Amino acid sequence: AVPTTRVVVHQSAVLKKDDVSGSEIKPEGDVARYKIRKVMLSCTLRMRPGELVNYLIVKCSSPIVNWSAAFTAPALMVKESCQDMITIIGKGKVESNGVAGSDCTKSFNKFIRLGAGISQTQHLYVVMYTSEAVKTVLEHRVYIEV
Amino acid sequence: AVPTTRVVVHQSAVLKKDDVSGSEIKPEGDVARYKIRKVMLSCTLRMRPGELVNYLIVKCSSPIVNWSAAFTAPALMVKESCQDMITIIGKGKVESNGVAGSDCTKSFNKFIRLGAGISQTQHLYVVMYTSEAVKTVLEHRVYIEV
Amino acid sequence: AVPTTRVVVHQSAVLKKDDVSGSEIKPEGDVARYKIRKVMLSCTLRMRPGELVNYLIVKCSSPIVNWSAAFTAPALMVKESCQDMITIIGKGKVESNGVAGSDCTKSFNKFIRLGAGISQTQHLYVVMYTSEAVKTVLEHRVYIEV
Amino acid sequence: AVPTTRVVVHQSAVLKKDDVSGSEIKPEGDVARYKIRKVMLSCTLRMRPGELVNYLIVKCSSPIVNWSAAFTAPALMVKESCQDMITIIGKGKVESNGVAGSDCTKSFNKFIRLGAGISQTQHLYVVMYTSEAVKTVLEHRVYIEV
Amino acid sequence: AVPTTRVVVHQSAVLKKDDVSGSEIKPEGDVARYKIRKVMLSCTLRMRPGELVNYLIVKCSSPIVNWSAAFTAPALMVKESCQDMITIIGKGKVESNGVAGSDCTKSFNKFIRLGAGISQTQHLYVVMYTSEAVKTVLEHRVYIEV
Amino acid sequence: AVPTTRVVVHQSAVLKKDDVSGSEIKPEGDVARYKIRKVMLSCTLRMRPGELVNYLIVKCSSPIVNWSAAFTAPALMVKESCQDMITIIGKGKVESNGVAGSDCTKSFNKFIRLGAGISQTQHLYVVMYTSEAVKTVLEHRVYIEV
Amino acid sequence: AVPTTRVVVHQSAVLKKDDVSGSEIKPEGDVARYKIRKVMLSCTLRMRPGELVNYLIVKCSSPIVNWSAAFTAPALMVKESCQDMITIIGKGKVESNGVAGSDCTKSFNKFIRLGAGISQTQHLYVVMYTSEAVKTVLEHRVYIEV
Amino acid sequence: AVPTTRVVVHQSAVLKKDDVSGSEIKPEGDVARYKIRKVMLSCTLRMRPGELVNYLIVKCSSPIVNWSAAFTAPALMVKESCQDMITIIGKGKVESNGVAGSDCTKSFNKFIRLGAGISQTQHLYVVMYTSEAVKTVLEHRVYIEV
């Protein structure tokens, strides 16, 4: 009975080799006071044809500026300093099984069902460690309550 | 007890690189007044060996002319302008893990079970975002009630 | 328990003889992300004293630009092209039983109870076919959930 | 579960003073093999401002050519020759309470719910006795099963 | 299981200003020995545009010749001399809200359901007091058991 | 509740002595997408007054061109090559007990009740082996669901 | 308790680019009067390293000579002419994700459990559309009742 | 109710071709007296694009120095000398389906749920047999009770 709206926000990010990098998935700012219930994210990263992109999808309050200081580099393990600060709700890994120099274009889709919502003060993040310079076009349809 | 007929319509489409492009799946026009209950679509796209084809299968009334204005480009997210206009019932993604310059020929099959039918005034669409020029030969066996 | 607000929007329209003409009833734009639950519309059309105003109140997604291409002229029948596109929830007819040249001022009121709401992506319309140039002052108190 | 379609057919008829005149309400001929379940007819007759239009809505097989030989003139009574031939399912009367010489434009609407359908071999008729030359624009949305 | 027949008898009567005037509704005489169960009468009186026609529908044995001596003039009250002689089963009133000198044509319809029949020895009457010279075309479909 | 239609198709066939000959019973082609539920066939063969006409009524998919290669000559036995291809649902035999040279005119009627319908892709056949040149006028009222 | 025998029949077929081609899976002919209950087929097609082999496994009576006239080319959709003639019981698709010019050797295995058997008059087919010249070595262990 | 802590320890190991090599997964030594309940390990081995890494995850007391003397070389089978000494709780295999000389970077993730804990005297090991020189960056989030 709550008035739901499924808004779509995209986020383009060209990121370097070992950069653990996170993007907040949230409505476009013109909707404040929301409450994210479901997220359908589909990030289609163009990447080098031998490497991998290990992604995590984490609910946390207190928005994280530095990413390497909260997630470990070669695969996204939540460090114990931000252990209970950061709650993992999504995982995954996109490996490029392609050719020598023809860069692949692989996508991960994930339909996260957030239990008891994520408000505008909390932050739903998608963080990723790649192994080459990738060209993520990460967009997401959030299912907010406003 | 309703008189069912499983008709087969094919649709060839050579489409360019970032073209979000949709085809209506429907009987051949000689059958008006139908009611699509099940669709078995099998699109065998010949495509470049590094790219992907992200497809959506959407039930909507009010036939969509412009596709980029209703679905986002790099993966098919239903924009909030056409949010409740367009109902997603099928998803998927076909990635080309092949060679440098030998173009692959990959197919997606999908047996959509449409709840409470899709009449001739509604429109069942299959829309797809590719990442290179693909040669889709999308055909489909619909299971109409006439 | 949902925070309700009853906002009032007016819409003045002087429309010609056989013009099937529709106005969207919606909040004033400063409230996006609403959900219309009840509408009390009261349109007081000043009209010529021999004619009639046949009105329909229709819930539809996909906002209709051309009105004659979706509703028939002499009384508002939903054409079969937009058959399941357009859902009728209100009807009525205001006839002018007056004098030779003294133009009457007659009003229709309608308290539509919209089942399961009408969001900001759907469009609640009031469409009307008149038979002379009328001077509708159609205002409406919507009962949105924001 | 039967595939329903709501088609709209209009019928313009300018008819003279005491002409008992009937129009078959049926789909447009391009749909044969139908089965009419519901009819929403709305006839907006422009008429002289002192007279009346007494209409009947009758289900009958065996399509009636001569109308005065089956219905009585000053109000539509089914004559005993066609007594069980013709089944009344709708009645009504539109009186013009207007001015001396300013012709009114009055409409009757009727949502007939036909029990157990009306097939294409039966004929649903709307017959009317007027008392002046009227300009009926009788249209109707039938709810056929094909 | 009784053999029913719905016969139609019309009765034209041009009657003067304050004439309380009654017509027997009955089959055409070629059917004796009937038993009237239902009557659908529809009298379309053309009348002067300021006056009224107050009608009563009365079951009585002993056919009434003089009408003013059994019903009062300005509205049809059954006088106490013929109090239990005359049983009222239908009432009504047709008022002419029209113009100065353009005579209206207004009709009353009444579907009387006679309890336990009216035989050919009883008399079902429709009596009316007008207030100007009217041009009643009173016809009726009776539902006799023969 | 399915819209039924009882259409009548006739088929004239003058066939020779030992010709096992079959006619498809089906609607006239203007109705595609049907579903035959009941068939009332009545074939009135004029025949020589000493011979017999042994007929079979068979439901089969895959329309049979050659008849002797599926049914045996002197009485219609379904050969084992088309054993499960052809399902017998009607039998019979019309013998001519007449005169030396006065050719009789004998008819067989059969009201086949097809279980779970026969669609337009299946074929209901009536096949017959005669013993002289007969003049069959085989007509049939099918009871299709369209 | 029925005497079962699991016989093995192989079928070598080198077939061209867009050839929809079908092989009957059946015992070797020395066993007539069988009843196929289970089939374990394993076809190891050597094929070009970019293409696909879309196969269908279909139970039908009336053995099909022409394959393109019953199945559509780019993916095996059963055409509506042979709609109820041909019953699909197995599907699948073998894609070659290999190298430029080193031809792969990929196999599909399928253990079809045929409900209520397939006799020697019916025909169990495996039909396949390839996209290059393939070298199928399709063999199958059928589980007949004789 | 036991005080849980999820600590993250990484272990980099560049290991040669047929080296069965094991790493103890354990907290960093500053936490003694722990009790490992859950382990989320994610090892992202960069490896040659034709080979495989077969890994085992084994709970054992008595820390193993020599690895080839407890696990067999070409796939990790627990030898019968250390049969009940070593308890397997995790398995898996990472194959490199890539290119000629472009080394892939593939990861295995495993969320081991250790029944009744693993204390600091026991040793949870992850052992792996590769087939080329790999560059494992094996890190792990253990879920200890201190």
Author numbering:
A (entry chain A), B (entry chain A), C (entry chain A), D (entry chain A), E (entry chain A), F (entry chain A), ...: 27 to 172
Sentences from the paper on this structure:
Image processing of the best resolved 3D classes enabled us to compute a 3D map of the FBNSV electron scattering density—with imposed icosahedral symmetry—(Electron Microscopy Data Bank entry EMD-10097) from 5,156 non-binned (1.21 Å/pixel) selected particles at an average resolution of 3.2 Å. The CP fold is a typical wedge-shaped jelly-roll domain—the most prevalent fold among viral CPs —composed by two packed, four-stranded, anti-parallel β-sheets (named BIDG and CHEF according to classic labelling of jelly-roll β-strands using letters B through I). Each jelly-roll subunit is oriented so that the lateral sides of two β-strands (F and G) face the capsid interior and the closest fivefold axis, while the two strands (B and C) on the opposite side of the jelly-roll contribute to the outer surface of the capsid. The CP subunits interact with each other most extensively at the interfaces generated by the icosahedral fivefold symmetry axes (subunit-subunit interface area: 950 Å2), where the BIDG sheet of each subunit is tightly packed against part of the CHEF sheet and the intervening EF connection of an adjacent subunit. Fewer interactions are observed at the twofold interfaces (interface area: 393 Å2). The fewest contacts between subunits are found at the threefold interfaces (interface area: 301 Å2) and involve the first visible residues of the N-terminal stretch, which appear to emerge from the capsid interior, the adjacent C-terminal stretch, which points towards the capsid interior, and two loops at the base of the jelly-roll wedge. Though less resolved (>4.5 Å) than the density of the surrounding protein layer, the residual genome density is comparably strong in the neighbourhoods of the CP-CP fivefold interfaces, where a putative aromatic base—sandwiched between the BIDG and CHEF sheets of neighbouring CP subunits—protrudes towards the main-chain atoms of residues 102 to 104 of the EF connection.
Nanoviruses are plant multipartite viruses with a genome composed of six to eight circular single-stranded DNA segments. Segment S encodes the capsid protein (CP) that assembles into virus particles, which encapsidate individually single DNA segments. Here, we address this question by reporting a structural characterisation of the FBNSV particles at quasi-atomic resolution (3.2 Å) by cryogenic-electron-microscopy (cryo-EM) single-particle analysis.
